[PDB]
Design a protein around this ligand. Structure first.
Ligand SMILES: CCCCCCCC/C=C\CCCCCCCC(=O)OC[C@H](COP(=O)(O)OCC[N+](C)(C)C)OC(=O)CCCCCCC/C=C\CCCCCCCC
Ligand SMILES: CCCCCCCCCCCCCCCCCC(=O)OC[C@H](COP(=O)(O)OC[C@H](N)C(=O)O)OC(=O)CCCCCCCCCCCCCCCCC
Ligand SMILES: CC(C)CCC[C@@H](C)[C@H]1CC[C@H]2[C@@H]3CC=C4C[C@@H](OC(=O)CCC(=O)O)CC[C@]4(C)[C@H]3CC[C@]12C
Ligand SMILES: CC(C)CCC[C@@H](C)[C@H]1CC[C@H]2[C@@H]3CC=C4C[C@@H](OC(=O)CCC(=O)O)CC[C@]4(C)[C@H]3CC[C@]12C
Ligand SMILES: CCCCCCCCCCCCCCCCCCOC[C@@H](O)COP(=O)(O)OCC[N+](C)(C)C
Ligand SMILES: CCCCCCCCCCCCCCCCCCOC[C@@H](O)COP(=O)(O)OCC[N+](C)(C)C
Ligand SMILES: CCCCCCCCCCCCCCCCCCOC[C@@H](O)COP(=O)(O)OCC[N+](C)(C)C
Ligand SMILES: CCCCCCCCCCCCCCCCCCOC[C@@H](O)COP(=O)(O)OCC[N+](C)(C)C
Ligand SMILES: CCCCCCCCCCCCCCCCCCOC[C@@H](O)COP(=O)(O)OCC[N+](C)(C)C
Ligand SMILES: *[C@@H]1O[C@H](CO)[C@@H](O[C@@H]2O[C@H](CO)[C@@H](O)[C@H](O)[C@H]2NC(C)=O)[C@H](O)[C@H]1NC(C)=O
Ligand SMILES: *[C@@H]1O[C@H](CO)[C@@H](O[C@@H]2O[C@H](CO)[C@@H](O)[C@H](O)[C@H]2NC(C)=O)[C@H](O)[C@H]1NC(C)=O
Ligand SMILES: Nc1nc2ccc(OC(F)(F)F)cc2s1
Ligand SMILES: *[C@@H]1O[C@H](CO)[C@@H](O)[C@H](O)[C@H]1NC(C)=O
Ligand SMILES: *[C@@H]1O[C@H](CO)[C@@H](O)[C@H](O)[C@H]1NC(C)=O
Ligand SMILES: *[C@@H]1O[C@H](CO)[C@@H](O)[C@H](O)[C@H]1NC(C)=O
Ligand SMILES: *[C@@H]1O[C@H](CO)[C@@H](O)[C@H](O)[C@H]1NC(C)=O
Lengths: 119, 1273, 173
């Protein structure tokens, strides 16, 4: 599937950010089979940390580096898996990934967003 | 005159302006001979040297008033430019304007544009292009822009009347150019790339002669207006009937009787989403995507024990096969009319509703599918024939010579030609002996014989060339291709499996001696000769459709694959690449458009797929029909003049046979000479008495009644006869009595007519043979040898008893006489067909002999992947390990020439062709496991066959039979050959209703109020108001669907009640206005009956819906409303004539239907006797089989249209284990074994389809004759 | 095929009689595992006493003196999906006259579904010393002969009348 994400996302400090991640798959999304992996990495070659996942329902693992500031803001039924955020300090800057698997589709997708925190 | 070539100069322009002033002061047609795009008239002679391509003074005085000039191009083509300043900036006298003009007029410009267009048409076939395919597209856009600017500068944009934008083909070109650059500036990719396909249509503009025939097609379609209106109205009426009868019946399913966990039907329904869960609660047949249909009647499908029939779920075929809504009903009725996969809908509807509903399908098939198709076919022929007549009318308005002479005398003799002909026949016969399991000795014999034959042919090649040399040799058409073929054979001998089959084309040398094969060659030559432009337009249209389909749906076919194939891989028929898109388009042309469109819908949207498929079907069928009728009429009318003498120079074969007969006569005379030299009054009165008795009407009627009874008694021998123990014996003794009666009748026929007058009669011979068979069987049964092998098998010939009615019923006798008269030409055409098909059968044998085997898993019947078990040795090694593994072969294949003939028949009728094609394209080798589409481009073999041996051949047969029936009618002296003498006078009386003069207006009432009411009710405004009310009622009927709410039901009921009261009011008004004159008009009495029947139905449906409970009766009686919408015909002069033609044709169709019913009855009895116990697989079912007379008649009516005959034949081709069990025990009967008889099955199912084809062409003769009569007179 | 032919109801003393009990399933393509039980109520008795049971290709005969060594299976053989459940009497006596009952216990095997169904068929058998002829055969033969003779007489009468008229006309001419 094709995934449409912004390559660069500049968000002012002290403001709520939102990560647009959308994909197109011909098959109606089934909540009993959708597999989703939101991961964050400090860099391209850095380790990716999983912070939000959809196995049967939206489950947020509440990593300490994000506290409770991570909220789901999309809707898989309408193919929107975007993640919205609460106000920030510059440490949140990094790379965000949304891996998507929508069976019976064969291929697996990956959309990359390079979040940036402005002064 | 040659002097009239003056230039266009200052003085010329001044004269033009003076003439414009004269025309203004004055304030017709231009010279057709000087119309632009035509050749220069011969009066003007040769163009002077220096004046080619120069702006010349207008050559037509009609334009002397206006400012326009002429430029003449090499080839005498007249290009009419405009003298007004181009763009308002330039003028005819300009350095750039003249250059652009000459460039556009030149040929190299046209050749360059055509080359660019045809290269772009090759680059359009790449589904995904490489990245470098952008410089080429930039080059194409540059070339097109250069051409556009050249035309702009040559002839102005839009300044005057003779400009760029005047030509309609310029609107397409500019609309493309703008989109290309506009899109590049923008940079849905699919739509933008689809708009590029319009560049292909420029081929029609550039290639000479295609524009005129495209215009001809557009002019021909305009004649199909009345026919299309009638077709739409008839399909709408039948769709309303179907939507009323079968609303929601296809949602029937078998539901579990016992549930658990307090689960109800709705609770179960609102959870299941996948087929593996649906299969747990509904009955699915193994390997089926749709739940088994069931019905609530006694003659419907029966669910297993523990399953109950309920109406819930979705309709079959992804939900597209339904009668629930008017749109789906209309789609189903269009599918029925086109007879595309209609047997599946037939079977589904009968299983869901009941077998007594086959009457609906009979009426639809024999009133809409076979008649409305003939109106379209007849109208186009009349439209084409009128065009052709106008075209004809417009056209009317030292040592070398020693060997040379010797060899010439040796070879150029009649005997050698006959020897070569026999050699060709023997070589073809030798090639026809190939088959798959061929031993090495047989293979060596075949190779040696082929070498001998090719050596003989090469020898004669060299002999003839040395005899006359290659200057005189290469001047003969037959010689050219003979040399080509011998060269190819030599190449093959020196060197695959195709070049060996090119010697088969030598069979066409027999065309010289064979008049009716020259007709086939002439048809083929015309298709690429006179009508080559039409064939080219057909090719261009098919290419455009393939490209459009690919561009639109290729990406979807791949992305949404799991919606149409559970393996998530592309199905057999898709649009993902150009070859498969073209295959789908060709299949649609062949006539199969629903199976491949269901997947299209599922992947890429109903609106898009429907629009594309409807456009493809309509336009492609129009072009194919135009080509077919053009070839037919042109070829079969060109030779009518007898323009050349019959064999003026006798053919070498004719001379050889003449010499042979002369020699035979000489030998006979010599031998005869040598052998002769060496060595009663009472009897006559009795005969007269018997004549009197047997000629009596009472005797004839009694014997006819006995014939009917004895033929009907044959329908009681079902498999259930053992339950009817009294009927058994009653029928036995009735059979004995019938035998006695017919023996006495034959004896009286003898004693009356005489042993000569009786036995010189074919009808008497038939009756004698039937009674003799009956007597022999009776004697054998009485003597105790009833079960004696062939004697027992003779009992099966009692199915021929119905044949005794042909001589008794004049309606069938007349049609039988026509068929007997037409037989000879049918045999000639069949001979040519068999010879032509032998070539393709041999080629198919050489291509596919023994390569249809495969190793399958008998549980799911799935071919093993070739990664494992790649050959037969490994298949057997796997057999020894597992148990449910089989090395199977197709039952219809190309293993030898006979099975090749059967396969070619199935392909030409389009029934088993998919099953054969899949194996053909999968074939790898002999003893090798097939791989998926290993030989993908084998589809071309079947494409080329379906063209040559099923389109040109059908054209030839249709022409021959039409000419033969015309000759028969001429011999009778302009008498209808399908009507009996009594029906002739009724036909003549009916004819007068089409030419009645208008009657006097009804006199006004002599009463003050009645006169006003008459004046009001006799108005065109009143008629139009009633027509619009009928249309609104039709819309109200159409707005009804399945699952509608009770409020919708109530409002629709009240609307219909209001319409009923309005029509009753109109009836009352017309009554009080026209008094007793009212009932003198047939349409008015029809309105009266319709009104009364509507009221009665409305009042009676309440009783059927309030006290009695009979949904079937309620639905049947609610059909009385369609009588209200049938009144639309009265105000349609267009379709009334066509329905009158149908009414006039009915008398002839009755006889043909009677004969067809008799043939169907005979074949039904034979099928009951033979195929009652064969194994139930493929097309033989619990409901569609030969166990009973009704089931047999259902199957036979189905296959009368040639639908599913392969599926009915397949179960009968099992004759050995493990396919069938020869000693299976059937409870309740003594018959053993469920095996079929392959030879009897093949004979049965081939002969029946051939006979039905002959009867169907008889019906098209009758319909065409009546349509022509009604259109003319 | 499968046709439920009703059993005969007349056995001749001393010979062999086959009692028919055919039970066909609604859909022939389904799978099943059938077994049967027969019960017999002798004339003059009011109790149905089980006499035999057949399952898994083995006939288990009860210890009944009236049927000992006089019954053999005549049903479907070599399968567990029985549709013919007949039995054969190898030596018919007067104790074999009464109402029979053929119980069929069929167990369909569906997809994630098992249905245990049952049927009962009643056969009444009367034992006689001679085999009576069928009344339908009697009437059919008599009707055939009367119709044949009637047709012959009618044709002969018509021939005689027409010939006498022909001779009279010829003598007039
Ligand atoms: C020269 C060229 C001439 C040809 C021009 C093109 C002519 C035809 C127009 C086609 C385009 C219009 C179609 C749009 C229909 C549409 O988008 O509407 C949707 C509805 C069905 O919607 P649903 O949810 O009820 O079914 C859902 C079913 N499930 C369960 C699978 C989801 O389509 C329906 O009603 C069924 C649609 C049937 C329409 C009639 C087709 C037959 C036409 C024959 C014309 C003669 C040739
Ligand atoms: C698909 C079929 C769908 C239904 C079709 C309509 C069925 C009902 C038709 C009306 C029935 C009562 C008719 C009463 C007599 C009407 C009448 O005037 O008959 C005669 C008319 C003649 O028409 P025309 O335009 O002059 O003919 C061409 C000129 N020449 O010609 C007619 O009106 C005769 C029509 C006969 C009915 C059609 C054939 C049925 C078989
Ligand atoms: C090709 C072989 C292996 C299989 C078929 C046998 C052929 C040797 C036969 C089949 C039909 C025959 C043809 C059928 C009829 C004619 C027309 C005949 O012309 C006439 O003089 C007859 C006039 C007429 O009745 O039309 C000349 C021979 C020819 C071409 C025959 C040539 C020999 C043919 C091709
Ligand atoms: C005009 C007359 C003489 C022939 C009419 C039938 C043709 C359309 C047939 C005859 C031979 C056929 C060809 C024979 C062999 C092949 C190879 C076949 O591919 C393979 O066999 C697979 C090879 C591989 O993958 O290794 C693809 C189709 C093709 C070109 C066939 C295309 C269809 C052809 C031209
Ligand atoms: C042109 C000729 C067309 C051929 C037409 C011949 C008719 C051929 C007969 O048509 C098939 C059905 O009408 C009869 O089968 P059924 O099973 O419906 O019989 C009645 C069943 N119930 C309702 C009583 C249980
Ligand atoms: C030309 C000759 C054509 C023959 C003309 C005669 C009509 C031929 C049509 O005959 C129809 C019936 O005889 C069919 O018989 P059934 O299948 O209904 O048998 C079962 C019926 N019962 C016994 C259960 C009620
Ligand atoms: C397996 C066995 C298959 C047997 C096939 C049986 C074929 C029989 C088909 C019928 C075959 C046709 O019957 C023969 C007659 O038609 C030929 O004589 P006419 O019709 O020309 O007689 C003159 C007609 N008028 C002038 C009196 C009207
Ligand atoms: C296949 C289509 C079948 C439907 C056609 C319905 C035709 C129904 C209408 O038939 C039209 C009648 O004029 C001819 O039928 P008859 O054969 O009764 O009239 C002539 C009577 N003689 C000449 C035998 C004495
Ligand atoms: C109009 C009349 C035209 C009738 C055309 C007849 C075509 C069919 C003729 C040949 C139809 C019969 O051909 C015989 C072969 O089919 C033999 O098949 P097997 O070798 O499998 O052996 C079967 C034997 N058990
Ligand atoms: C033939 O096909 C059948 C059915 O697909 C195979 O038998 C079972 O198939 C299922 C999958 O539908 C497997 O899960 C089972 O393990 C199979 N049963 C076995 C092996 O007993 C069967 O394997 C196939 N035949 C061969 C020779 O592989
Ligand atoms: C199917 O039904 C039959 C008949 O009711 C069952 O057979 C009975 O089973 C019970 C025990 O569950 C016994 O006490 C009866 O004596 C049996 N009667 C007969 C005539 O056999 C049978 O158990 C059922 N089969 C299944 C698989 O449930
Ligand atoms: N060989 C063939 N037998 C038949 C019988 C009926 C038929 O109807 C159709 F509409 F297809 F022409 C076609 C054919 S082709
Ligand atoms: C009825 O449904 C309840 C759950 O609502 C369940 O506990 C009970 O077993 C069910 N009874 C039956 C007979 O299905
Ligand atoms: C076939 O199978 C049998 C039993 O498994 C085995 O004994 C025998 O050797 C096998 N034969 C062949 C030819 O593989
Ligand atoms: C028949 O029944 C009688 C008792 O009514 C018994 O005495 C006799 O032995 C029986 N015969 C057989 C063969 O069972
Ligand atoms: C039946 O049994 C009786 C008594 O044993 C015997 O007389 C008779 O022959 C037997 N009949 C047959 C057909 O075995």
């Amino acid at each position: 599937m094709e995934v449409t994400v912004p390559a660069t996302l500049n968000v002012l400090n002290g403001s709520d950010a939102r990560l647009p991640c959308t994909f197109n798959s011909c098959y109606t999304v089934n909540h009993k089979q959708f597999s989703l992996n939101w991961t964050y990495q400090e860099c391209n070659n850095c380790s990716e940390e999983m912070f939000l996942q959809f196995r049967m329902k939206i489950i947020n693992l509440k990593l300490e580096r994000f506290q409770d500031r991570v909220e789901f803001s999309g809707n898989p039924s309408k193919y929107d898996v975007s993640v919205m955020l609460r106000n920030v300090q510059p440490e949140d800057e990094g790379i965000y990934n949304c891996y998507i698997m929508n069976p019976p589709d064969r291929h697996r997708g990956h959309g990359k967003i390079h979040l940036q925190v402005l002064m | 005159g040659p002097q009239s070539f003056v230039h266009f100069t200052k003085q010329s322009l001044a004269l033009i302006e003076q003439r414009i002033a004269e025309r203004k002061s004055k304030e017709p047609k231009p010279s057709s001979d000087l119309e632009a795009g035509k050749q220069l008239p011969f009066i003007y002679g040769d163009i002077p040297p220096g004046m080619v391509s120069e702006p010349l003074e207008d050559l037509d005085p009609y334009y002397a008033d206006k400012k326009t000039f002429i430029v003449l191009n090499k080839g005498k083509t007249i290009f009419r430019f405009n003298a007004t300043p181009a763009l308002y900036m330039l003028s005819p006298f300009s350095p750039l304007r003249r250059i652009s003009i000459k460039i556009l007029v030149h040929s190299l410009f046209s050749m360059l544009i055509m080359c660019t267009i045809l290269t772009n048409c090759i680059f359009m076939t790449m589904n995904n292009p490489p990245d470098w395919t952008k410089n080429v597209e930039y080059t194409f856009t540059g070339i097109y822009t250069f051409e556009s600017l050249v035309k702009i500068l040559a002839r102005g944009f839009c300044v005057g009347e003779f400009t760029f934008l005047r030509d309609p083909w310029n609107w397409l070109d500019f609309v493309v150019i703008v989109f290309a650059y506009l899109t590049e500036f923008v940079n849905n990719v699919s739509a933008l790339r689809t708009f590029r396909v319009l560049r292909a249509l420029k081929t029609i503009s550039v290639i000479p002669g295609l524009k005129t025939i495209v215009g001809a097609l557009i002019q021909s379609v305009k004649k199909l207006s009345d026919v299309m209106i009638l077709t739409v109205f008839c399909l709408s009426v039948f769709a309303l009937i179907g939507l009323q009868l079968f609303m929601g019946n296809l949602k029937h399913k078998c539901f579990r009787n016992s549930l658990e966990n307090n689960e109800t039907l709705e609770s179960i329904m609102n959870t299941l989403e996948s087929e593996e869960d649906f299969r747990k609660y509904f009955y699915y047949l193994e390997g089926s995507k749709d739940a088994l249909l069931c019905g609530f009647s006694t003659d419907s499908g029966q669910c297993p024990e523990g399953y109950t029939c309920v109406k819930i779920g979705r309709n079959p075929d992804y939900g597209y096969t339904s009668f629930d809504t008017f749109s789906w009903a209309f789609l189903a009725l269009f599918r029925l009319m086109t007879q595309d996969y209609w047997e599946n809908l037939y079977q589904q509807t009968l299983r869901a509703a009941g077998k007594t509903y086959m009457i609906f399908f009979v009426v639809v098939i024999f009133l809409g599918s076979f008649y409305l198709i003939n109106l379209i076919l007849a109208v186009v022929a009349m439209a084409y024939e009128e065009q052709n007549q106008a075209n004809i009318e417009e056209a009317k308005q030292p040592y070398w010579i020693k060997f040379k002479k010797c060899i010439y005398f040796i070879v150029m003799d009649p005997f050698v030609d006959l020897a070569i002909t026999i050699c060709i026949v023997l070589n073809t016969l030798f090639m026809a002996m190939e088959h798959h399991p061929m031993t090495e000795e047989f293979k060596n014999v075949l190779a040696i014989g082929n070498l001998v034959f090719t050596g003989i042919f090469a020898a004669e090649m060299v002999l003839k060339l040395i005899a006359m040399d290659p200057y005189e040799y290469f001047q003969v058409g037959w010689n050219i291709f003979d040399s080509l073929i011998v060269t190819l054979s030599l190449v093959e001998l020196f060197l695959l499996s195709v070049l060996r089959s090119f010697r088969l084309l030598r069979v066409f040398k027999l065309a010289k001696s064979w008049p009716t094969l020259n007709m086939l060659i002439k048809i083929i030559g015309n298709s690429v000769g006179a009508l080559g432009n039409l064939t080219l337009v057909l090719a261009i249209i098919v290419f455009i459709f393939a490209v459009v389909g690919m561009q639109l749906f290729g990406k979807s076919y791949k992305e949404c694959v799991c919606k149409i194939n559970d393996d998530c891989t592309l199905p057999r028929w898709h649009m993902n690449d150009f070859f498969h898109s073209f295959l789908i388009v060709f299949r649609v042309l062949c006539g199969e458009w629903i199976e491949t469109m269901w997947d299209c819908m599922e992947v890429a949207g109903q609106a898009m797929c429907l629009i594309v498929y409807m456009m493809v079907m309509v336009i492609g069928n129009l072009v194919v029909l135009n080509l077919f009728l053009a070839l037919l009429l042109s070829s079969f009318s060109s030779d009518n003049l007898t323009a050349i003498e019959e064999d003026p120079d006798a053919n070498n074969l004719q001379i050889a046979v003449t010499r042979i007969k002369k020699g035979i006569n000489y030998v006979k005379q010599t031998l005869r000479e040598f052998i002769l030299k060496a060595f009663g009054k009472i009897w006559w009165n009795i005969r007269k008495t018997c004549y009197k008795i047997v000629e009596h009407s009472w005797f004839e009627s009694f014997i006819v009644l006995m014939i009917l009874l004895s033929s009907g008694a044959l329908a009681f021998e079902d498999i259930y006869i053992e339950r009817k123990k009294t009927i058994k014996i009653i029928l036995e003794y009735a059979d004995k009595i019938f035998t006695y009666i017919f023996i006495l009748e034959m004896l009286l026929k003898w004693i009356a007519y005489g042993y000569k007058t009786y036995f010189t009669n074919a009808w008497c011979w038939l009756d004698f043979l039937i009674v003799d068979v009956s007597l022999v069987t009776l004697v054998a049964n009485t003597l105790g040898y009833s079960d004696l092998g062939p004697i027992k098998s003779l009992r099966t010939l009692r199915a021929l008893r119905p044949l005794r009615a042909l001589s008794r019923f004049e309606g069938m006798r007349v049609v039988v006489n026509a068929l007997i008269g037409a037989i000879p030409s049918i045999m000639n055409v069949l001979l040519v067909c068999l010879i032509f098909w032998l070539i393709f059968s041999i080629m198919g044998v050489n291509l596919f002999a023994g390569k249809f085997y495969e190793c399958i898993n008998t549980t799911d019947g799935s071919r093993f992947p070739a990664s494992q078990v790649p050959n037969r040795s490994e298949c057997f090694a796997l057999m020894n390990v597992s148990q449910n593994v089989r090395w199977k072969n197709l039952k219809v294949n190309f293993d030898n020439v006979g099975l090749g003939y059967l396969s070619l028949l199935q392909v030409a009728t389009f029934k088993g062709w998919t099953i054969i094609m899949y194996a053909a394209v999968d074939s790898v080798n002999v003893d090798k496991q097939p791989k998926y589409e290993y030989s993908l481009y084998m589809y071309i073999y079947f494409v080329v066959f379906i063209i040559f041996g099923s389109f040109f051949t059908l054209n030839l047969f249709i022409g021959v039979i039409i000419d033969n029936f015309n000759q028969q009618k001429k011999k009778l002296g302009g008498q209808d050959i399908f009507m009996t003498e009594e029906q002739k006078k009724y036909y003549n009386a009916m004819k007068k209703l089409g030419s009645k003069k208008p009657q006097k207006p009804i006199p006004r009432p002599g009463n003050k109020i009645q006169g006003c009411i008459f004046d009001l009710v006799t108005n065109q405004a009143f008629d139009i108001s009633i027509m619009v009310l009928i249309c609104l009622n039709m819309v109200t009927m159409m707005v009804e669907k399945e699952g509608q709410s009770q409020h919708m039901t109530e409002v629709l009921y009240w609307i219909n009640v209001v319409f009923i009261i309005l029509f009753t009011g109109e009836c009352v008004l017309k009554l009080i206005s026209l008094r007793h004159y009212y009932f003198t008009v047939g349409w008015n009495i029809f309105d009266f009956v319709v009104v009364i029947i509507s009221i009665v139905g409305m009042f009676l449906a309440d009783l059927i819906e309030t006290y009695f409970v009979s949904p079937t009766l309620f639905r049947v009686i609610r059909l009385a409303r369609i009588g209200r919408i049938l009144r639309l015909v009265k105000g349609a002069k267009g379709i009334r004539t066509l329905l009158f033609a149908l009414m006039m044709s009915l008398p002839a169709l009755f006889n043909i239907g009677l004969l067809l019913f008799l043939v169907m009855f005979i074949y039904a009895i034979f099928g009951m006797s033979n195929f009652a116990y064969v194994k139930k697989e493929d097309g033989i079912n619990d409901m569609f089989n030969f166990e009973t007379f009704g089931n047999s008649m259902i199957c036979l009516f189905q296959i009368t249209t040639s639908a599913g005959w392969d599926g009915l034949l397949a179960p009968i081709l099992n004759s050995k284990p493990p396919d069938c069990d020869p000693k299976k025990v059937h409870p309740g009967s003594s018959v053993e074994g469920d095996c079929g008889n392959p030879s009897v099955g093949i004979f049965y199912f081939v002969s029946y389809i051939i006979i039905s084809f002959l009867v169907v062409v008889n019906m098209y003769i009758a319909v065409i004759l009546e349509n022509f009569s009604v259109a003319t007179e | 095929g499968c046709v439920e032919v009703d059993s005969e109801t007349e056995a001749v003393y001393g010979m062999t009689f086959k009692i028919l009990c055919i039970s066909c399933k609604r859909r022939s393509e389904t799978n099943a595992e059938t077994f049967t039980e027969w019960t017999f109520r002798q004339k003059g008795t009011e109790e149905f006493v089980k006499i035999l049971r057949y399952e898994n290709e083995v006939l288990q005969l009860e210890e009944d003196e009236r049927f000992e060594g006089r019954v053999v299976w005549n049903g479907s053989r070599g399968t567990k999906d029985l549709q013919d459940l007949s039995i054969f009497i190898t030596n018919v006596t007067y104790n074999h006259s009464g109402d029979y009952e053929c119980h069929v216990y069929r167990l369909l095997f569906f997809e994630n579904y098992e249905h245990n169904t049952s049927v009962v068929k009643k056969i009444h058998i009367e034992v006689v010393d001679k085999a009576n002829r069928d009344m339908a055969s009697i009437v059919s033969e008599i009707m055939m002969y009367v119709l044949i003779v009637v047709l012959t007489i009618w044709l002969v009468a018509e021939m005689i009348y027409c010939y006498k008229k022909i001779a009279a006309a010829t003598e007039t001419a």
